Design a protein around this ligand. Structure first.
Ligand SMILES: *Cc1c(COP(=O)(O)O)cnc(C)c1O
Ligand SMILES: *Cc1c(COP(=O)(O)O)cnc(C)c1O
Ligand SMILES: [Cl-]
Ligand SMILES: [Cl-]
Lengths: 381, 384
């Protein structure tokens, strides 16, 4: 019913194909299926099921709310599966997390005190992962005095039987630019900081630093576990890394819509807000009923590609809240016709990366921000 | 329980400001009814709550894009007044035209396929349709072109009225350049709206309302008001354009405040990079604040290195790239406690940035800033 306007087709078979492709590239490691941000706009639970089915033994989320929803899923995901969440703030539901058997990242002393406190109240121990700041400079614990202290506080919490440090981990800043100096720097600092913590008595199940581009291009970086997010959704972290086809990967999301309106307009007739496109001669206009409220970026005004009626069209002028227009040369498809904004590539459609370029951003943002008003349709469940 | 997800971040929706705005707007358009446009989840502010507030303060029409949005308004519990008019315009073939006619929605029709589908549905349902013909005055998006197409649509509508299947309750259009005051096209569209409406009345159509006015029109063009105004963005207290003015210039107060709690405050040496691609490196020794919102939450990635955030009493600006769930600010050397409030935007009166300030940092319009705040950011409603 709502699918008639537009839809995001989520091909869960492609997803499973990707997870397998990725388990091949990282043969000596477990794979985490990162399903944060509603599985990058693809649907958290469905994608998480598919990714376990195909060999993911860890799930990854940002917020603890996301991770708890995975654990509350009906039907249940395997209870034996590990679920990690990293984005915590003071007063967060640390108790509910320890009870639900989540792996929780800790990168700072306030969090260590809060998680330890919660393990006491709950009675059962915590699974904690220390985040090390290797150079990224976002979240993460800085080396030297802060790391010393956190490693130590973790060691005491292990003594007292309140938690076991199940991992040591970090994140790359520039892995998507292959052979950039910082990659090697962060990597040897990850080895120093991990070595230090093991040398002082911590015994983790897993070390991990690898995001998608790392996983694809740096076998040194794999360690016990990989976190290829975007690559699991079949999209390349960077055109410098390669196409999805280069790594045996197939895009999972196809974004399509039905033409609301096909109409003939004379020449010198403006199109959309600010009249930033006026028709060159007499022509036809197609109304695609998706706009920036649906996550069609407004930066892709005048540039965004759409396959309509067998040819690539491009957005004519500005993108509105709910709609945009394409110039159809003089072609006259029936209203209701399919307008495919992006997909895998094999039916002549543009890809998510093509929209990333039109909008001056990364493909990550294109898929993740597809609006909740666009219903998701799941195929090959 | 849900008082747990607010700790990371929240969008505070001040429904009293919204009611203040709907009144300010009814004042600017004294000879007209006001439609509260609550499309796109009330521009990211929450459709139903805002719709209630807007009715409370004098809106006698509600406006949506999709028929799904409008049907949800009609299904609201507790109910909105049954006497209130709800219009929806963004239709595609095979859409739920029957459910719309039954639910007593005003439906836009701008094309012959739709006229046939809506008429067909009125037959099946047995009760007549309320239809609004959309006229293409110059915008060139979804209306009916003048001349041969308008002639035909007006005529098909007239026949449908004869047969008792629908009554054309409105004739309407939309401005392309009203946000740029005195642009030539405004006057052009407006006189073509008068020609096309005159034509349809002259041929026997008798509408309840003519309307063309969006927010900027409503604020700057009393000629444009006609029977009804559709000020969307202005109702949420944000100015359609800095060229039109500030919200304060029109007695309007922004409804959404977007705030978050610092996840991390930490000291880093100089020459230490920040975020993806190392597009900010620290000038000397300094402090970094982690704000736990990213582009998945609708913090535009175009506002990398530029986005303003009030933290600890001073405006900070985004340090380098915005990630999926987080960004960093350079805090000089200040050391606020983690859990401290980071206000990204609001009304302006506590020293915060506004939605327009983010629009500029990201190279876009404020409309996009508020509308695309993610569903993973819980909304908190105050003064309901
Ligand atoms: C976002 C994220 C990932 C996956 O993202 P890619 O860049 O697609 O690999 C992995 N790990 C962490 C900690 C993240 O925050
Ligand atoms: C978007 C929209 C509006 C509101 O425009 P503002 O500039 O936000 O006031 C009004 N009417 C229709 C038909 C719309 O699509
Ligand atoms: Cl980090
Ligand atoms: Cl139009």
């Amino acid at each position: 019913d709502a699918v008639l306007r537009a839809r995001a087709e989520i091909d869960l078979a492609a997803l499973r194909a990707n997870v397998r492709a990725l388990r091949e590239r990282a043969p000596g490691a477990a794979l985490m299926a990162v399903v944060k941000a509603d599985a990058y706009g693809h649907g958290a639970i469905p994608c998480a099921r598919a990714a376990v089915a195909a060999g993911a033994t860890w799930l990854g989320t940002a917020t603890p709310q996301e991770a708890l929803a995975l654990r509350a899923a009906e039907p249940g995901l395997p209870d034996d599966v590990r679920i990690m969440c990293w984005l915590w703030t003071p007063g967060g539901p640390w108790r509910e997390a320890v009870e639900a058997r989540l792996d929780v990242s800790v990168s700072a002393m306030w969090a260590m005190e809060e998680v330890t406190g919660a393990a006491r109240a709950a009675g059962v121990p915590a699974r904690v992962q220390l985040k090390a700041d290797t150079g990224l400079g976002r979240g993460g614990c800085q080396p030297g005095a802060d790391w010393e202290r956190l490693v130590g506080a973790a060691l005491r919490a292990e003594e007292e039987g309140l938690l076991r440090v199940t991992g040591l981990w970090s994140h790359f800043a520039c892995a998507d630019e292959p052979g950039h100096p910082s990659i090697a720097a962060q990597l040897t600092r990850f080895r120093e900081m991990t070595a230090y913590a093991e040398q002082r008595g911590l015994r983790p199940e897993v070390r991990h630093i690898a995001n998608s581009p790392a996983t694809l291009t740096l076998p040194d970086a794999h360690f016990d576990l990989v976190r290829p997010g975007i690559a699991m959704y079949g999209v390349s972290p960077s055109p410098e890394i390669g196409t999805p086809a280069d790594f045996g990967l197939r895009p999972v999301m196809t974004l399509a819509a039905s033409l609301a309106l096909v109409k003939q307009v004379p020449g010198g007739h403006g199109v959309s807000y600010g009249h930033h496109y006026t028709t060159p001669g007499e022509t036809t206009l197609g109304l695609v009923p998706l706009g920036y409220a649906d996550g069609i970026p407004r930066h892709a005004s005048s540039s965004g590609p759409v396959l309509v009626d067998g040819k690539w069209r491009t957005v004519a002028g500005r993108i509105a809240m709910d709609q945009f227009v394409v110039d159809l040369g003089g072609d006259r498809p029936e209203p209701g016709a399919e307008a495919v904004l992006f997909g895998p590539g094999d039916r002549g459609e543009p890809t998510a990366e093509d929209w990333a370029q039109a909008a001056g951003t990364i493909a990550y943002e294109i898929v993740t921000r597809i609006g909740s008003r666009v219903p998701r349709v799941y195929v090959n469940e």
